Design a protein around this nucleic acid. Sequence first.
DNA 1: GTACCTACGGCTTATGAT
DNA 2: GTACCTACGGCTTATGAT
DNA 3: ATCATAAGCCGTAG
DNA 4: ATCATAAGCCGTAG
Lengths: 511, 511, 381, 381
Amino acid sequence: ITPVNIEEELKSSYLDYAMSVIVGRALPDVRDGLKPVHRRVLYAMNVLGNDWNKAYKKSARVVGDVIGKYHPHGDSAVYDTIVRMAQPFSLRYMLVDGQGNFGSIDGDSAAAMRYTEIRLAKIAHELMADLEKETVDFVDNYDGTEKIPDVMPTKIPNLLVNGSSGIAVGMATNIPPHNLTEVINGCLAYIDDEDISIEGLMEHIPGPDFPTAAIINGRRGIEEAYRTGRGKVYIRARAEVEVDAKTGRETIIVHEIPYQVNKARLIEKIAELVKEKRVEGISALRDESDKDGMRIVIEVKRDAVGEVVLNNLYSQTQLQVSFGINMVALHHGQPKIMNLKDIIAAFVRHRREVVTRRTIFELRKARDRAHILEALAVALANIDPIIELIRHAPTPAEAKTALVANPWQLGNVAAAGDDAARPEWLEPEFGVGLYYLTEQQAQAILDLRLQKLTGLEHEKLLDEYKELLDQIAELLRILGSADRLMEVIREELELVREQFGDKRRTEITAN
Amino acid sequence: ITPVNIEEELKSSYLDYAMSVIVGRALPDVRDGLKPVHRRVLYAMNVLGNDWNKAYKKSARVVGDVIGKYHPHGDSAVYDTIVRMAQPFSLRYMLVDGQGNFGSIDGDSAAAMRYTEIRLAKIAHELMADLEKETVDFVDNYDGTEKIPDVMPTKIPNLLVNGSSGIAVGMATNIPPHNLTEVINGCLAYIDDEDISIEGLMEHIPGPDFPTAAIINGRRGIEEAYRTGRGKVYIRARAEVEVDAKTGRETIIVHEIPYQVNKARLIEKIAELVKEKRVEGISALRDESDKDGMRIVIEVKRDAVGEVVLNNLYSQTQLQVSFGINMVALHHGQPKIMNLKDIIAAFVRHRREVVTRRTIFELRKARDRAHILEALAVALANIDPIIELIRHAPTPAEAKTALVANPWQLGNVAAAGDDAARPEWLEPEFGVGLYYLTEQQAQAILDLRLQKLTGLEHEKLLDEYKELLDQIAELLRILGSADRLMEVIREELELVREQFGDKRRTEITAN
Amino acid sequence: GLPGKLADCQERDPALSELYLVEGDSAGGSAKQGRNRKNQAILPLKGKILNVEKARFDKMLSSQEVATLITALYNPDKLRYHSIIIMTDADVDGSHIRTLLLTFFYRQMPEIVERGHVYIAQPPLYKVKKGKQEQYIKDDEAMDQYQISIALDGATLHTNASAPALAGEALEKLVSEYNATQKMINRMERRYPKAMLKELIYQPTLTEADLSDEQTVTRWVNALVSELNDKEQHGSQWKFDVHTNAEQNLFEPIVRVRTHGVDTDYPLDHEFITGGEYRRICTLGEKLRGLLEEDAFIERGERRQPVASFEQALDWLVKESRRGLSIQRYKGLGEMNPEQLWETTMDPESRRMLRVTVKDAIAADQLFTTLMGDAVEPRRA
Amino acid sequence: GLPGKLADCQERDPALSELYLVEGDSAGGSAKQGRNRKNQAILPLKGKILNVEKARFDKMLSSQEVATLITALYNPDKLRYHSIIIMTDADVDGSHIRTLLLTFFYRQMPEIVERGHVYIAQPPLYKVKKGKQEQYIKDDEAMDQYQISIALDGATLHTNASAPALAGEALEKLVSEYNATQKMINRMERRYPKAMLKELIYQPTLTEADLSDEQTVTRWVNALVSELNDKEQHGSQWKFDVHTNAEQNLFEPIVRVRTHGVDTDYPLDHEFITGGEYRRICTLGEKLRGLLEEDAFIERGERRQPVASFEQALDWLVKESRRGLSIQRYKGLGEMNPEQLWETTMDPESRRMLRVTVKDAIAADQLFTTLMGDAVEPRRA
DNA sequence: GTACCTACGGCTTATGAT
DNA sequence: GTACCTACGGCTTATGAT
DNA sequence: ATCATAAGCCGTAG
DNA sequence: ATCATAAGCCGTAG
């Protein structure tokens, strides 16, 4: 049986692949700034239980675990992504605190996956905080046997802090890193004023940030990129001339190279250009880098001002390179060029939703706990008749039935708010002194011990009851007015800013 | 500081390496017939919890786990060892039930470690049975953070069933597989007669066994090997002539190749020999193997008897190959050539030790459980005074002190053997009606629930008490006389033989 | 070139042997282990192959083995291996490399495609084994129909309707139509919420003539909001609103929902009422309300239970059917046994090939790699 | 040969630069990352190298890079790299490859070893970091002495002996002698059980003159068996027996122990009594019994606890010392940082090299590979 | 994503020398 | 135990042609 | 002297 | 024409 098929099927195949790739592999999201690979790796590290204050663990365990349960797409890319996060000179804020040969700026690759030791950092727990409190949704795996969180309940806009650079079948994005303190300040300013202008946001955040300092010249490019989404910016290295107090000779000191520059390739290209006579004023070349900071020495040829040579280098050498700013991400699963204000608004909305869901979950939990404690205290009030009823009843099920069938006296020492002390699904036929039990309450009573009959357990129960009342009152209050919610958000953001504050690295010299 | 060192250090270095290798890598033990790699792999599979009646699991998970926790010596050898066990044509009884491309007789290697799915078999649980009952010792890992069993509490002499073939710096061993039923019969015969002769053991076990059948000719070699430890034995393939009912022509059918023979290499060598004119009477060559059994067809040249050609092949072709029997293993960590009787005796002694230790552990556990149940029943006898004592005492520690300080009445309905109902460390100042409690007993009483006050819990407790009495009586009895121990061993071995019985594969034709 | 990878068959006459192209190791291993030695040939592949248009250079060549072994690269002289078959994994990467190979052959040798020689295999996708009963399934729709059949293997419904024991093709067609409608609703869910769409199954009908009386509109929207509030067990609210945008009436209801922090309205328009989706919804709702399926009794095949919802009964039946089945999904050619691979992919009596056509000369390949077509084509909304 | 692997230094004059030989990737990576660029040279190695005697063939060559880069393979003309250093892992495989390299050089170029040019490095073995206090330890004995020092950092014992506060070098030497005796007992444990050896610490002395009175022998063996039965908390028993093998007495006690299923005797002989091991045991037992260390009070450094056993007190002190320390063991050259590797292995002011000698011309290499020496040499009993 | 090197013993198989 | 091939877009850098 | 053609790099994937 | 020397393969390890 060979049915005839049209050649047009070629379009249906390529379109499916392109859509699947664009949706699932390259483009990150505005709410996390993380790729699904990073998502699965972080989720696996969290489920395994590798905190920052614990012993190190081998990389093979984590790699095999991720391959087996969540990411069945090889090991090479996974290991490369893991090594990428541990490099200090590759990200403004590292996420995977490791120990071992992780490569360096010299382009040398890291060691095998059977030597390194990795674990989470203190900042990593700030990303996946409040996970088990039903704050996000769960997505099934490839075979429908596990659950994967859709979005991370984060507290820091990692998209604007670190950024990424990927290329898809149709689009390509690239975002520079930034400083955390200025991002928090801009978020606070936007919380203060929803109708803030671009100049007001640009005033708080002058420019981007890099793990290694540099020099920025063009101011029009960064403004055009912040306003529209595309622009160009130049990066200049830090150098200077040196003349001895005596006759001596001129000398150039290199303190830092631009972002994403190979040192060995750069030195090789400089040596080649010197050999090719294309550059003048250069005699020799040395290196003085150590564990105290990178230091490159270039000997200036005799009878040379050196400034013209340095300008020629800046014109030709990789010490001056541009940058293709391109901000493209997903908003509802669709590539859309979005500005700073939209990202900030989406972050605020995500935070509001997470806080609301966490509050609802905590309120339901506290309601259930208080409703159980009420019946427990009622059972503590009258004890002796329950003792006789248990002693007479042969069957525990019959004892439960007898307990449910009979009302209770509600002693004076036993006897809060008018409402909010009962679950939603609870029927009005219970708790109308007058009081009735429930099969669940009866089982909870049957699950009591003898230690709960001391002169301290009663006081502990009363204290817990009052505490739960205060907690549910505060939760109802924060659910009532959104102003308290905004105050809580502001306080949490200020605390986060106070925790992980730092100092500027790069420098912006306008022309 | 450069201290002068003698050149003699070369001997101290090589000796250490040789000793370490010989002790830890190549030579197996007589009590398990397993290499330490197989030991660690089986222990990891048991700790992980991959039974036979469970879902399959990826190989990467197990490989990474073994590398991380127990065997930090690469992955290639581990994966090769894992694949070796799953091959049906490589062992008489497979241990790792897998699913996927595991190679074949054609010499083709298996797929990568990211495709296969493996799990334990029903026979595997017979190897590591009764592990957590303190039957063997625990050995520390390389960094002293984990525990590894020294020997496996096995029930089947895997050394004689499957055997192995390794080569050390000084020695080299090789043992053919055998049949399980005849080994069990020989073990039973040795249990019957400790002074059995070699002929009596040889009478029950004619010869070895292979995963694929073959033809054995030399009888002196196997006898000399069983008596001393060294010998030679020849292996012959199964073939036959074929003549059609009509004129037709002669044809040779190959049903099976000898042990450890590559089919592709064999066919290539036969084609080469035919091309080189070294062999006569061969015209062409074909193949008819399928999923129903291997079948090789060789076309006989016209005007040829074929028997002379077949004899020339048997003389030259790999269809007839010898075998270097060499039985060398460890007895107390020292290479010693040992015969069959010594291996059987060591197996019996190991089984006796395992059974004795398991019995002691079970007896101690039952003693502790019965001693706790006695105090629990005593507390069940008198309840109301305990109720008042708990209601008056504010502090639970003070309540425990008051309970311990006061004697008890030992009601008539509460009131076994004269002894064996109390632990060894128990002091004679308790249980002298007359009865006293203990802080542990008092805490157990405090850890009671309300469900234990029905008309059925008392009967359940009495039944459990009588059952524990019967069990400790039976354990004391089996510890008393060794005849009951030998009877239990015989019954267990007969049951094992009844479970995993099979039929002979190979064939022995004496000359 | 010729050695190393290509393993030809005994026959040297073309138009009798077949050539295959798969991933090299994981597939070629089992392929050679299970292949025949009469008219079988296998040429492995290593990774991916460069595109023709993205980088066009006659000197550019990395493997060249395919062309070197098929022809001399010009073709009318040597036409060895008149029949070729492409076996490929069922993933998106397999489909991608398939598209690359197709466009490569199309832009290199048009005659081999015009003369009808290219063939595409259809590897299995699911292996369902219900104890002794085994089954090989290749498509998602086939899997779904098989599941529906396993669920509808001889049930018998007993409602208080005109039929005492309603069962058979009518019930099966009703379940199929219900599944199609649920799929349509799941597709349209991107626009409107799902609660109202699910409730319209039991809500009464609606007609544009109802825009005369305000009382009828108020009654309908009140019943709707009340039942929504009743069925809502999560943290959401529902409010009603009646709007008049006309010279006199043009009654237009507005449904107000209150989620976590933001309210959202959903007015009803003449276009939405006239839409074929809403028309099908109303027709199916009438058909289901005319069933009186409240008290029901259906068994498959030894147990029955009266419920209050047809979808709940369907879910219970699906659960009872899926209790004791086993499914294995093959996610790669290097995953099954060689005998299974043979019998299910390249058995001249059990395989299912596919023929390519040369229907029209179009600029699909031209729009392929320009980045302009790449930007404009994703219009799948 | 010259490219690819060898990374020479700027200086071309020999006898000033140093050459190193390590495992290729894992070691050479960090080595080149941390090396200097003035007088440093690194030649990686891939796996192992064939033996000289096991397979002797002048035509046999696989790498040949070492010889090709050091000399012309004949040596007096070119003597480049007058100084060589061998860095090797601390495992048994590293020691094996070290032995192979040593015998290779010895059997190829005797002059380079005679003139004193071969050197062996001593990589660190332990990294102990007690918060701010760090330490680099290379040997097991050094690690043990460091642990003993950390445990004996200023303790002060208070017994009821002649010294009210006994502490210092006397106590430290006593602990060292006790540890040496415990090591000797652990070594001799292969012959006799450990219970009796541990109990002889507190059991009274014994003399060959005690073979006159049977009552004294009976009293001693009865006390021994009674204390053994008291200390036995596991499933074992102990019985006594007095034997006379002489013309008149030659009193010889026999200790009968009952393990799981088999009893075992252990008579006492004049040779065992005269042995230096038993003599040292008796001397240390007398020294310890002459201490009256029952009621003791030792603190390190803010807590003390009276116990009834000196070994129990020692274990408690070791536990208190090892509470808050951290240890990392480097099991490979490709495990630490490049700066640490430099500073701890190839710092011309912090390293610890080793010189080889040409003391005697012996047949060790001849006995190496004959299988006769291989069979006869394992006499380590 | 993948092709060739070593130890270690015991066995063999093949090929030039006495 | 290890060296070279591809897609995919956006950017650049270099080099021969108008 | 000023425009068209050949490369390299960025990150997942094989 | 009959004995001494050079290989390849088997499985853990690097």
